[PDB]
Symmetry: none
Subunit: 264 residues, 4 copies
């Protein structure tokens, strides 16, 4: 804007004043003390040359010119981005995952699952690797609301625990790939025991209907394995959604339980 | 009584050049809506320039193709897709995620994160200290960085912090996670690592004033929900900065780090 | 004198059967045989009493004394003097002095009661920190395979969160080798107010332990100094294995199906 | 009604005593002092175990950490792969497999050897690939035949861990004792 007006009058300007236009056409200029004193000392010109340049540009003088020079830069810059390409690949990978999950939500299903946890006597969260930390996280959150739950992160524990579940148990299995055999095959063992089974996967079903519920979670935005964000995060979206539905079932009794940590 | 987008194209057809007319004929077909009508796929279908398409949109009275193609598709819209079908609880959880992204954006100090990435690279052995939800964060970071060749350990108890600080040396880096910013064990332990020569980084959502000592103090996002019970996963504030640091740290000597990461599959 | 000259010096006092045996033992090749006492009898087709009579003719209190001497002479190995270093003997001693002290502390009725409590509970919990956390995990691994619904906890957050959800169908077992781990003692008390039964395993009696349902006294370590003691799990592994053995005999058949279901496909 | 002690108490304690008897017979004193030295020589020491052997690995991590050894215990095979990819010539790995055929541990130790790391296998069965690792330690076999009636599966390894601990403690004892007491 102010750069275009400069170019339109650039010719009418003397070589020295043309130099002053050149300096202010630089982006680096703003990162500098732009008082008339410093500009004159810096470019080794007189005040009069500065005033003549500013009026060449249609302003009454340097003060009006520089007053806009600041505002302009503040009216932009806040419009531009101040984030590195890496900080932005990270921020967009999260935003992309929040967008995609919002498309994936089956809200009736999540309230169905919140009620299943409520009606279960014992609940178990199966996962390995990063999805085993997700399973750990669920146990702490739902324990504070009074759920009897346990987190298991290895194959011995899976088989060991499946053998002692019954129709009053609920097992939530987390397999981002939708392939992790340890988890998938152990959810099938629990069904044979009569327990209800919910599978979380970022990968569509392939006869996944064998489980009580299959929750489709978001795939990652980054195609390369190394460049992705936490493998936990797709699962955390829906844990926090399920948590929010579950908390509202008998919320009054659950807050008593949640608070009795503090109560001596 | 509203002007259908089709009636509009014809109202301007006779103001159009011949090429614009060819574009109009394509867009006047009812079966054209069942196409990918991005500007990049329409140009190739019609073998025209993006500038030629913009001119067509402007002949029809729009500010550009994006405006034109929205109305071309909004009139075909079969439902009130705009309205939020969500329930207040879903939208409470989602705002909590989005708001934390925003507060993270405003808190990032990119020079510090690269520095912390460099601290991890320059250290030979690095330890992550955390309890409860933050111990899960510490364990997650271990999975992230050990697959890039870093010598790291995740600790999740006061006894471990003590046993590890007693053997810490100057070539150690300890990252401590205390969302409240006042966890006595995490803070006491990081001073134990300081006295043993190791560098210390604290992650906290509250600007800790008495702890100007640690090599670095990183301000993390606070949760948007006032009540603890309704908050989202307490890991996520820290996960934001782990992913950022990881992104910074991966670009430092990437070839060897990708080689270690891919060696699993090897 | 050798053992063959004594066998021969009594040969003429011997019965015909005893001389047949003397003939077996006078052979040089016979010491490359299993000379147990039940093996020699089978081979010679004789009775133990007949072998004892043989030994007695040779001047021994019985066969076991005779065969020992017969095997001492041939042997040059010092199967008597220990080959171990002082450090090895000290560790083995500590492990054995713990078998001994454990044995001196066993209260068989108490351990039977404790097994029954585990059976009567619907949910069981094991609380322990450090090395006592590993014991808690092991107990969980052994008892879940007998069908018990149990959980192992290793930090204060876990104890507090789980105690607040405990009810009268709960049984919590706390491991504090020192007997004064504040988190274990307090968590056990919190579990009591929720109505659960409580068992403390400790090597130090403390007045405050009378508050819990049971106090189990475990072995103190032989080594005075912390750094030289053998381990920290060992005193409790002793009693876990004893309680387990008791607990398996309660409805064994059921817990043998659950145990073997793991192997089953 | 059940003698001085009962049949069950005698069985449990006779399993412990027999473990001590078998352990004493099998000890290879020079081997144990060799492993003690190796642990000192390594810059990083790792302990691999599954199930009950995993608890043994966690204890060894606990004990040798208080003496100054930089150690890490691993229970999940995914972690076995992640650590194997970063091990070098100055790493020592102790794998615990009571059966001697738990795949994860065997392949992990092979992988560690490929990276140039010292490897030690604990096993109640003499592994056929005995020379494969720098050392192959023989541990006690359980007295009871039936799996369900056996005493703790940990114990065979706890014996040799304390033996190695007692030897390794004497190497540079004074400095390790200072590290131990820095806790208080
Ligand atoms: Cl991503
Ligand atoms: Cl929140
Ligand atoms: Cl001892
Ligand atoms: Cl046994």
């Amino acid at each position: 804007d102010i750069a275009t007006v400069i170019d339109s009058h650039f010719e009418e300007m003397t070589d020295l004043e043309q130099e002053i236009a050149r300096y202010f056409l630089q982006a680096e200029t703003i990162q500098d003390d732009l008082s008339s004193q410093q500009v004159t000392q810096k470019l080794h010109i007189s005040q009069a040359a500065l005033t003549r340049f500013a009026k060449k540009c249609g302003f009454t003088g340097y003060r009006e010119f520089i007053f806009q020079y600041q505002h302009e830069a503040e009216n932009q810059a806040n419009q531009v981005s101040k984030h590195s390409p890496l900080t932005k690949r990270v921020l967009r990978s999260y935003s992309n995952m929040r967008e995609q999950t919002q498309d994936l939500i089956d809200e009736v299903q999540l309230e169905r699952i919140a009620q299943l946890i409520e009606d279960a006597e014992r609940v178990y969260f199966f996962g390995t690797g990063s999805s085993g930390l997700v399973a750990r996280e669920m146990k702490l959150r739902f324990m504070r609301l009074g759920v009897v739950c346990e987190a298991l992160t290895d194959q011995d524990g899976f088989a060991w625990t499946t053998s002692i579940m019954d129709e009053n148990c609920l097992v939530l299995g987390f397999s981002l790939s939708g392939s992790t055999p340890s988890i998938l095959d152990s959810l099938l063992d629990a069904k044979e025991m009569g327990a209800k089974t919910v599978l979380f996967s970022s990968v569509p079903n392939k006869d996944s209907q064998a489980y009580t519920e299959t929750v489709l979670v978001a795939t990652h935005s980054q195609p390369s394995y190394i460049q992705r964000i936490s493998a936990q995060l797709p699962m955390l979206f829906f844990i926090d959604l399920i948590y929010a539905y579950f908390l509202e079932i008998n919320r009054e009794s659950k807050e008593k339980i949640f608070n009795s940590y503090w109560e001596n």
